[PDB]
Amino acid sequence: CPKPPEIPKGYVEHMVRYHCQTYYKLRTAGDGVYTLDSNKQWTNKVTGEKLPECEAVCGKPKNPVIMGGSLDAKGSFPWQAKMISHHNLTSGATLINEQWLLTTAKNLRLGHKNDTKAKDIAPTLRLYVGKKQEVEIEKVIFHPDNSTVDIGLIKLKQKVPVNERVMPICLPSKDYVNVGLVGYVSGWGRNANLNFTEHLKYVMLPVADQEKCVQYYEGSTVPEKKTPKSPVGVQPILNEHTFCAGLSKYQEDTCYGDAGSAFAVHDKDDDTWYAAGILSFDKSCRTAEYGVYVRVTSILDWIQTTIAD
Amino acid sequence: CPKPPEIPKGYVEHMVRYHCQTYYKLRTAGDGVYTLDSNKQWTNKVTGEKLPECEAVCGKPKNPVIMGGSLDAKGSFPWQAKMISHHNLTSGATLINEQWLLTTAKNLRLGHKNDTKAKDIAPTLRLYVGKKQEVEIEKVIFHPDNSTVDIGLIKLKQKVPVNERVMPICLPSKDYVNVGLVGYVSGWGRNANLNFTEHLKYVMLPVADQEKCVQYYEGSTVPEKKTPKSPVGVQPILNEHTFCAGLSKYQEDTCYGDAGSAFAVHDKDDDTWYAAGILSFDKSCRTAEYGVYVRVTSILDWIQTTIAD
Amino acid sequence: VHLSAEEKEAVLGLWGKVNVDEVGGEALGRLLVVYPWTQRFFESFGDLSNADAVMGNPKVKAHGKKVLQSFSDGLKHLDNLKGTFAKLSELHCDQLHVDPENFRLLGNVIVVVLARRLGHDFNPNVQAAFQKVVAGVANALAHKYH
Amino acid sequence: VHLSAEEKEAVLGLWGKVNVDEVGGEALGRLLVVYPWTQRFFESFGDLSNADAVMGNPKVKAHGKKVLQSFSDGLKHLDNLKGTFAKLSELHCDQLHVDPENFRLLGNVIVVVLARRLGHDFNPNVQAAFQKVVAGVANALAHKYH
Amino acid sequence: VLSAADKANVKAAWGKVGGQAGAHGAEALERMFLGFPTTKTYFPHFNLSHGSDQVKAHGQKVADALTKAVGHLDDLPGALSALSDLHAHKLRVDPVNFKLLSHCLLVTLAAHHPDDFNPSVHASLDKFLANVSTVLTSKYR
Amino acid sequence: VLSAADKANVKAAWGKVGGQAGAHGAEALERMFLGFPTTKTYFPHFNLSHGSDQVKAHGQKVADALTKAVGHLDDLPGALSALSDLHAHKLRVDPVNFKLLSHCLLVTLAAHHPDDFNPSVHASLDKFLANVSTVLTSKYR
Ligand code: HEM
Ligand code: HEM
Ligand code: HEM
Ligand code: HEM
Ligand SMILES: *[C@@H]1O[C@H](CO)[C@@H](O[C@@H]2O[C@H](CO)[C@@H](O)[C@H](O)[C@H]2NC(C)=O)[C@H](O)[C@H]1NC(C)=O
Ligand SMILES: *[C@@H]1O[C@H](CO)[C@@H](O[C@@H]2O[C@H](CO)[C@@H](O)[C@H](O)[C@H]2NC(C)=O)[C@H](O)[C@H]1NC(C)=O
Ligand SMILES: *[C@@H]1O[C@H](CO[C@@H]2O[C@@H](C)[C@@H](O)[C@@H](O)[C@@H]2O)[C@@H](O)[C@H](O)[C@H]1NC(C)=O
Ligand SMILES: *[C@@H]1O[C@H](CO[C@@H]2O[C@@H](C)[C@@H](O)[C@@H](O)[C@@H]2O)[C@@H](O)[C@H](O)[C@H]1NC(C)=O
Ligand SMILES: *[C@@H]1O[C@H](CO)[C@@H](O)[C@H](O)[C@H]1NC(C)=O
Ligand SMILES: *[C@@H]1O[C@H](CO)[C@@H](O)[C@H](O)[C@H]1NC(C)=O
Ligand SMILES: *[C@@H]1O[C@H](CO)[C@@H](O)[C@H](O)[C@H]1NC(C)=O
Ligand SMILES: *[C@@H]1O[C@H](CO)[C@@H](O)[C@H](O)[C@H]1NC(C)=O
Q: Which residues carry this modification: Phosphoserine (chains C, D)?
């Protein structure tokens, strides 16, 4: 602001219009233009003295596009976070906004006894986003239904600066999961050598028929006839709040440590990236036909509600 | 230079809106708002660093509303100027803008001989506006048609500051002169005691039939039959470029020294004050029925043209 | 106002043989008839349309007494005129807005009705002394004007 | 890579007794059959549909020779591995985007075809020396990756 | 501007003056020189003391000009023709003085004809003297 | 995930091993301990030196578990049942090691049966060993 020239018999009124950094969006009531009072107040007709806020754009990677392949070369999954237990097991996160990330309740408890309180689990975790950027976590919230929804929320102490590398995915406004839809699953979990992957990778997986999946893992469909038919040692959590994905065209699958990652769909109408699911059952490896994802639609209400406090 | 508050993750774009001191008005093509360039210069979308200008609001007195009466108590005729010849005769002026005033060619020559050059008349004059404020005059221009249009222009050395007391009248955009319309004529000329009035006064005069007027002063209408029938010693200049006014309801008239004053009409649509005429023949006193005014419409072209240099 | 020893006797003497109530009523009425723009100050007095109406007007008669009796009080103190009429000057200027031309005109009208009523008694020298007086109260009324 | 005096003789010695062109063509074909997501890199090679197709593929045979002959050059300089494969590392990382898992997988496949062709000659100790080598070229190919 | 009724009044009132005209003329002059001593300025060559027959004479000329005017009311500039350039140009007498003399004429008229000077007649005579004043001042430059 | 054709190949291949199983078991162990010395970590109580009959013995147990698996291909978790908690919980052996041992099993198999180990069979045996590896690692916490 160089002072503007004076004009004879006339004076000057000062204003400003606010703009946001790239990757952010102006949030106001409010036209963004603020103007200096005789009271030395910067004011706007709509919002009073209240300034605009800058908010991270979500689900819009700067460069859009696990036992099998697809190395993430371009950094196309900005929302992916890597979480590590005190006892050194890697698992997935997926950043949902500037200070929150979704994850599985199971991932959260990797260190500890299943009755461990969230207060005691949080100091234990290490969380990373983008390149090796660590983020400092404040709090952790398990989902209210222990047995059914495998989900937890991670609140960071403060907002992550958003850039090419780090940026949240979008929560869906609709139900994307119908069979045959191919989502993108990025993950930090174990690979074909049963080693935690050193570089972040992604697979493309089709969503699978829900009845076929339940017949696969359980008897089933009548509850009293259900048996534990899982071809790996352990049983998925399977209900109305979950969906299944098959293997890739190339027979690639998801494995230990991949849970907590998003089943990420790219909406062609929006050109935006939505999290349709969070990987719950990462034990398929190539051994079982189906991974199991908790569907983000089911947890949407709870997410907004929880973030509200 | 003023310091607007800070947004996190956002930057300011500086602007200014120009405003004008009261009694003045913004003159520029685009709005008065200039935003700061990345080239560090203040720019308008339409005027491009060309600044706005402040010019005087004309024809809008702060306090709206000669042998007879009506003392100007409120100072309702800001455009009225008093002019005095080297030999101490008072006459009228009427300020047309910040640096110009209309007057009659006759007034201008009061001290002098028929052929005196304008260069020589100007240093001789004294001119006052408002309260006893003197204005210093640079130049004087007689109208090109000596015999027909009794008019001159007076250019001040510099612009008058405009206020309650001093402010120009408006030039008409249309022809206000139709018989029966009552204009306001303010004037410094002689009163019922044949003495120059000590306080400025105004009369309200109706415009009169042009044909009746010509029959009154001249034969007439056929030129070769015209005789000098003026009831005072001297003949008005009467043509297409003049109009006539009668006496007031109270039998008041205009007298020596009132010439150069405006026949001022108040347009009810505009709520603004226009100069419909300039008093030419001030010899009417109460002796003759009609004063004669040069119509401002006829001199409009010439006025803008002359001010252009 | 500067007025001679014999001039004072003249004025005071003459004033003793004139009906001031009657001359005020006549003088105001004639001012109204002769200089019609003065009727503008009197709209509230009723019918001013023709001359017989103005002279016949009961409010004109009554108001004229008031101004001419104000004049009598003027003669009482000549040396301090400005202060006698100072109150009225405020009224006439700042309230009523009367041009001082009109004080002068009414002053002279009063002089012509004095002439008309007093005849040969109102000779050039006594008129000259009255002119000094009417110019004195006109100037005293115009005093509060800027 | 750190390799003992006797370990080098073992590796170099065995290498004299294997057909590297033939093992490359077998090893690449097996990797393609056994870990099918690797076929993704080879779309341009023609028919990869079934196993006989992959093994029978003339372009696979030919490309496999190229990789195993690149291995031979690896054995030539063990002390500077990173620099030998530096050029190829740039290709494999920045051009082709191969996950380093795949280098490790192919390395082990080569080891199982060496076992298959050499039988009793490829005994636990000579295999242990070969593991050091295949881990060396895998790590040398993954070197240019961030 | 002197209506038909005005003209009637003026003609009537001046006719009533009659042979006193020249005397009224001189009386108005003496009243003016005494009442408004500044008017004396224009007459430095005159004996202005009381009883001066140089003013008694001048008053006759003034009364005559007036009688001529009353006979000519439909054309004042023509009746007064020679006198306009005289007062306005040669003598160059400031217009304020004319209301002074007119006033004195009125005073004399009222004093000598109290029952003929009613407010209508007063009004007509004032206007007449005003019109004469204008004709004699309109060329003042 | 072990198709009918896969299962056929696995059954066929392991049957062809026959009496050599316990011996293939021990050889795979020695190859692992030599090739990937870190795996030695889980066996501090073992004499790991060449010809150790403590590993000759352990190799037999491993071969047997595998023979049991080959007879049970339609249910791996059931066949391997006790061994899952053993490796995942008691022994807590990191899942990377299972791909190592599987590899060594494959190396032994290829060395001893070169004309029976064609890429289809290689593929089937790899998947089988991978499925065993998963069953034994899925409870790792
Ligand atoms: C020598 C000259 C004058 C004198 C001595 C004089 C004196 C007075 C006096 C004593 C009053 C009484 C008001 C009161 O008691 O508050 C008055 C009122 C007034 N005068 Fe004058 N006056 C003079 C001239 C004039 C003239 C020339 C005009 C108008 C042309 C005028 C217009 C008025 C008006 C409109 C009032 C208000 C009375 C009412 O309520 O109707 N005066 N004057
Ligand atoms: C030890 C491991 C490897 C070695 C020594 C190796 C060596 C080579 C060499 C020498 C070339 C020649 C390219 C040129 O001359 O410009 C090549 C090309 C190539 N390699 Fe590798 N490679 C290895 C692993 C892999 C793996 C695991 C894959 C895929 C899963 C792969 C995919 C490719 C592809 C797609 C090409 C391009 C050839 C073409 O145009 O078709 N490589 N490699
Ligand atoms: C009703 C108004 C007047 C009338 C009708 C009138 C008429 C006349 C006449 C008839 C003459 C004589 C011209 C001659 O003898 O050729 C005259 C001369 C003159 N007048 Fe006036 N006059 C008027 C007003 C005045 C006034 C107000 C003044 C000055 C206060 C004035 C100053 C003179 C002088 C100085 C002369 C020359 C006298 C001499 O030198 O003998 N007149 N006027
Ligand atoms: C195909 C994969 C494997 C199979 C089928 C297998 C099978 C077995 C069997 C049958 C036993 C004996 C249990 C008993 O005697 O009750 C055992 C024990 C054991 N295993 Fe494994 N195992 C496998 C992989 C591994 C790996 C990769 C490691 C470590 C690198 C490992 C470490 C051990 C240890 C330390 C014991 C205890 C041995 C003892 O104390 O005698 N296992 N396993
Ligand atoms: C992984 O977890 C272990 C404990 O569960 C960490 O403990 C380390 O143990 C090593 C020796 O094996 C020490 O040299 C380190 O100083 C220890 N570090 C800590 C924080 O205890 C271990 O650090 C973790 N990761 C690694 C690579 O050692
Ligand atoms: C008006 O004009 C005259 C000349 O045309 C001015 O001349 C003055 O004359 C008086 C005496 O009569 C002197 O006392 C002054 O000094 C003169 N002043 C000048 C500027 O010449 C006259 O000033 C003007 N107005 C007044 C009020 O005197
Ligand atoms: C397994 O990977 C090891 C390295 O650590 C892994 O990859 C690195 C970059 C990190 O992401 C780390 O958290 C992972 O655990 C190697 O030292 C080791 O040789 C590898 N084992 C095999 C058989 O490849
Ligand atoms: C005549 O006017 C005198 C005042 O001066 C005049 O008017 C003023 C404002 C100036 O313009 C000035 O140059 C003029 O000469 C009064 O003092 C005087 O009383 C007036 N005389 C009569 C009879 O009204
Ligand atoms: C947690 O799981 C264990 C068994 O693994 C069980 O014995 C225990 O009761 C459980 N505690 C809670 C709070 O679920
Ligand atoms: C899980 O379900 C049980 C049922 O009583 C409940 O007490 C418990 O609070 C739930 N979860 C945890 C972590 O305690
Ligand atoms: C110029 O003045 C002379 C006298 O000096 C006069 O005769 C003539 O008519 C005048 N012309 C104009 C246009 O005033
Ligand atoms: C008047 O106009 C004429 C041209 O028509 C010109 O010759 C003359 O100089 C002008 N006179 C005056 C006084 O302007």
A: 44
